[PDB]
Amino acid sequence: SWEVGCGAPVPLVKCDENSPYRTITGDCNNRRSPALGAANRALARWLPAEYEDGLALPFGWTQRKTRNGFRVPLAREVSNKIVGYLDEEGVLDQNRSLLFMQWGQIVDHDLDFAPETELGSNEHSKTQCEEYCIQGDNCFPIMFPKNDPKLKTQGKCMPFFRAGFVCPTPPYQSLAREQINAVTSFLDASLVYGSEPSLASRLRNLSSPLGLMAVNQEAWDHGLAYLPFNNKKPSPCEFINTTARVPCFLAGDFRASEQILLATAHTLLLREHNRLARELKKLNPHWNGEKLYQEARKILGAFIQIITFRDYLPIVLGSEMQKWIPPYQGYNNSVDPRISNVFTFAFRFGHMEVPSTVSRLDENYQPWGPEAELPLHTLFFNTWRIIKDGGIDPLVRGLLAKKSKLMNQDKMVTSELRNKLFQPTHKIHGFDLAAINLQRCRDHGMPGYNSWRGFCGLSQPKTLKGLQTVLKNKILAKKLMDLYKTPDNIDIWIGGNAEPMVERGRVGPLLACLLGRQFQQIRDGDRFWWENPGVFTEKQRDSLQKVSFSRLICDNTHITKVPLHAFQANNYPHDFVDCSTVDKLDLSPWASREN
Ligand code: HEM
Ligand SMILES: *[C@@H]1O[C@H](CO)[C@@H](O[C@@H]2O[C@H](CO)[C@@H](O)[C@H](O)[C@H]2NC(C)=O)[C@H](O)[C@H]1NC(C)=O
Ligand SMILES: *[C@@H]1O[C@H](CO)[C@@H](O)[C@H](O)[C@H]1NC(C)=O
Ligand SMILES: *[C@@H]1O[C@H](CO)[C@@H](O)[C@H](O)[C@H]1NC(C)=O
Ligand SMILES: *[C@@H]1O[C@H](CO)[C@@H](O)[C@H](O)[C@H]1NC(C)=O
Ligand SMILES: [Ca+2]
Ligand code: NA
């Protein structure tokens, strides 16, 4: 009865079966179902979607319509009463660097992107949602509750547009709405290279046959490369300072300039590509541009994989790591490699790891100038501080030397994100990421908290007292019950993140299961996984085994002092060493001798 499936707005596929390299789109990874993991298809549904009308309308759309007999609470009221806090003193994670937060965002952006519907071009339909807050079609505005401070200074709502969905981009009325993943599900550096042939070519430097990615020609970082500007008007990064008039960057991923540390990480990875490509040109002078591009691309892909799977996931998942992602046993072509709709909310655990300030540090790892520490809200879409205020190096030192925010049941999301978020088009530092996440949860038709607990083989609390035992927090459980009325109706984003963290990790049991399962699948179901026999030679793999994040910094900045375990909390100068003592990526195994 379940159909072979739709796909009129998704194009053709034809697959070069000899090809030792990934496609840009993700097509052809899986030989029996070539579209599996490819960009611009439906996110996978691990559980049936749950919408108000069975099909497409989110819970909370129709005021009289309940969920399980109760009204769903406003996203912004859940934000105000649970997610927020005032005192930033004491929130910092004593054993994770700020790099730990930032790598999470990098990895997330490699795997999933569900962009807003395209309806407001040649059309003030976006402007009208904003201006008048009238719910309809793809406008699904986040209404302020009665006592909200923003009601006084900001109007009736925050605008919000429904995520794009496959088949039609107007609505459909027979099968349930499926949102699109616009990037490749494989952990494949698509955030560097693009997920679309169009973008991917535009990012390359073809002017020369050196397999280089294109770089900024207007500005340089003390001789080091910046990303090229995106010259597409209008631009949010110009808007945040019209006197500086520095545009956003153009990268493999649309979101690269959303905050200055992300743009920073993107810069390092672009540098790493060009550097690898130059080093390969030396070792194999006979290689053409396509060859060089592909081979650097492939190494960078492996780099992301290793840092993610060897260094990042164990310190997120802790004791549950082995339970969900056992040691690798090879490529299983029966595994679904697709990112699930629910993972795209699970991985938003990072939002509770983002701290209120970003610092620039000098070569002694001491404050850099008089405005060294800045509030995070002043750095959304901010390229001008990079270009006109010291380049990336002082930012990278902050990444190493400052700390991530630790998630806290009484201090979930900093007001920098919770009250001051800037979104493009819209003019103000006045949005709420937490409210947006909850509204999105609904937009995407997510099953509730207890449906996912059941999925993960965990208990399903029905009462206040049951919820108190699961959360190990009486007061939080009590606010959730007062808002949601039953635990079944608690939005997964908030329920998942309300759980106390597992031992040695930074997420609770439910999230560790949703994340662990996904990463297991992105590893096991990828034909081009770096450790799958034949992707790299045995010797290449011995060389790739030594990648570190420290080495990445050494090779692509003018920073000479680095920790060995860059994700742990590290204090200068004690936990820092000279770049000369840190293992290098030895590219000798890529010398292809053929005479
Ligand atoms: C200053 C730091 C960050 C900012 C400003 C930020 C901002 C945002 C914004 C605006 C969205 C879109 C919300 C929506 O429309 O539904 C979003 C989505 C997301 N964020 Fe963050 N974020 C940050 C850090 C992180 C971190 C550290 C992680 C993970 C470790 C993360 C994971 C995600 C994910 C998974 C999504 C959904 C992506 C998709 O499929 O579309 N973010 N973030
Ligand atoms: C917009 O960018 C300008 C350009 O960098 C910023 O002005 C700089 O800031 C201080 C003065 O307070 C000086 O050290 C720089 O030399 C300034 N340059 C210029 C041209 O004035 C300005 O602070 C930014 N404005 C905002 C609102 O972000
Ligand atoms: C392309 O590469 C050449 C040779 O390295 C370089 O001089 C030129 O600036 C590059 N162009 C861009 C846009 O990166
Ligand atoms: C391959 O995947 C399928 C479904 O996930 C599973 O039945 C099988 O156990 C997997 N193979 C191995 C070797 O684990
Ligand atoms: C800090 O984190 C590392 C992993 O980065 C861990 O092995 C170490 O034991 C942790 N230190 C403390 C004090 O918990
Ligand atoms: Ca990807
Ligand atoms: Na062997």
Side-chain angles (χ1 to χ4, degrees), residues 438-487:
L438 289 174
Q439 200 83 333
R440 195 63 73 195
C441 238
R442 291 163 194 186
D443 174 22
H444 283 232
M446 280 300 104
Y449 173 66
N450 270 336
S451 302
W452 291 112
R453 291 280 286 184
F455 187 88
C456 281
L458 297 170
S459 68
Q460 300 179 48
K462 306 290 149 182
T463 56
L464 176 62
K465 182 88 171 70
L467 189 59
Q468 292 172 352
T469 298
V470 176
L471 306 192
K472 292 165 152 47
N473 191 313
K474 277 193 194 72
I475 286 172
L476 179 47
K478 181 195 306 134
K479 300 153 172 180
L480 296 164
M481 288 296 284
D482 291 337
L483 274 174
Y484 286 103
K485 308 305 194 189
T486 164

Side-chain angles (χ1 to χ4, degrees), residues 205-208 210 212-217 220:
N205 187 347
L206 312 177
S207 314
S208 35
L210 298 163
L212 298 175
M213 295 295 275
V215 301
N216 210 289
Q217 297 311 327
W220 292 84

Side-chain angles (χ1 to χ4, degrees), residues 101-102 104-105 108-109 112-116 160 255 258-259 312 343-344 347-351 353-354 376 380 417 421 423 433 436-437 440:
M101 177 280 290
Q102 189 56 66
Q105 205 185 21
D108 181 291
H109 282 183
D112 55 273
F113 186 32
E116 287 153 59
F160 177 99
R255 300 155 291 185
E258 180 265 346
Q259 57 92 1
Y312 180 75
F343 181 82
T344 74
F347 208 180
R348 299 177 198 218
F349 74 78
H351 295 167
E353 298 172 354
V354 186
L376 172 63
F380 304 133
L417 299 166
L421 173 71
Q423 302 262 258
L433 188 52
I436 289 166
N437 283 340
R440 195 63 73 195

Side-chain angles (χ1 to χ4, degrees), residues 96 108 268 485 518 554:
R96 301 280 184 287
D108 181 291
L268 297 172
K485 308 305 194 189
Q518 189 72 80
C554 298

Side-chain angles (χ1 to χ4, degrees), residues 34-248:
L36 286 174
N40 289 114
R41 304 207 167 239
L43 287 153
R45 286 276 178 192
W46 291 348
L47 282 180
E50 282 176 33
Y51 285 108
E52 173 184 88
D53 65 343
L55 294 171
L57 292 181
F59 287 108
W61 184 264
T62 309
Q63 193 169 81
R64 68 172 211 285
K65 286 246 207 146
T66 71
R67 186 178 199 154
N68 295 314
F70 298 103
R71 290 151 167 285
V72 303
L74 291 166
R76 172 68 182 173
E77 175 165 5
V78 178
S79 177
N80 294 345
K81 291 175 176 169
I82 294 158
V83 184
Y85 73 97
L86 304 186
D87 184 11
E88 300 285 357
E89 182 166 50
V91 299
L92 298 178
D93 189 339
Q94 297 311 299
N95 201 29
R96 301 280 184 287
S97 64
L98 186 59
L99 188 65
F100 171 73
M101 177 280 290
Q102 189 56 66
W103 189 254
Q105 205 185 21
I106 290 287
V107 174
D108 181 291
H109 282 183
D110 197 304
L111 306 175
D112 55 273
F113 186 32
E116 287 153 59
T117 43
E118 286 134 36
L119 190 53
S121 284
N122 212 324
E123 182 57 67
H124 74 94
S125 54
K126 300 265 196 201
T127 322
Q128 188 156 325
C129 194
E130 190 191 309
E131 284 190 5
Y132 301 89
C133 296
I134 304 312
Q135 174 175 288
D137 285 278
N138 288 334
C139 166
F140 180 36
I142 298 170
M143 300 315 290
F144 304 132
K146 169 163 156 43
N147 303 123
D148 196 309
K150 287 188 183 281
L151 201 41
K152 296 162 161 191
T153 64
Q154 264 183 236
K156 294 285 156 181
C157 84
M158 288 168 176
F160 177 99
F161 311 95
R162 296 205 68 197
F165 53 103
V166 308
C167 301
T169 304
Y172 196 72
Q173 298 288 71
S174 194
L175 205 78
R177 176 177 296 189
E178 305 300 351
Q179 291 76 22
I180 294 151
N181 189 4
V183 303
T184 69
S185 298
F186 305 109
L187 183 48
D188 61 357
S190 55
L191 88 167
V192 178
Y193 301 107
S195 289
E196 265 178 308
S198 317
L199 173 63
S201 205
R202 192 188 161 175
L203 302 173
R204 291 179 68 177
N205 187 347
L206 312 177
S207 314
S208 35
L210 298 163
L212 298 175
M213 295 295 275
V215 301
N216 210 289
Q217 297 311 327
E218 302 188 27
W220 292 84
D221 189 1
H222 195 229
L224 303 201
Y226 280 133
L227 300 218
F229 289 123
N230 181 10
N231 298 112
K232 145 216 153 57
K233 265 155 290 192
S235 166
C237 304
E238 287 177 345
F239 186 99
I240 56 82
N241 189 344
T242 50
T243 304
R245 197 172 313 292
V246 185
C248 301

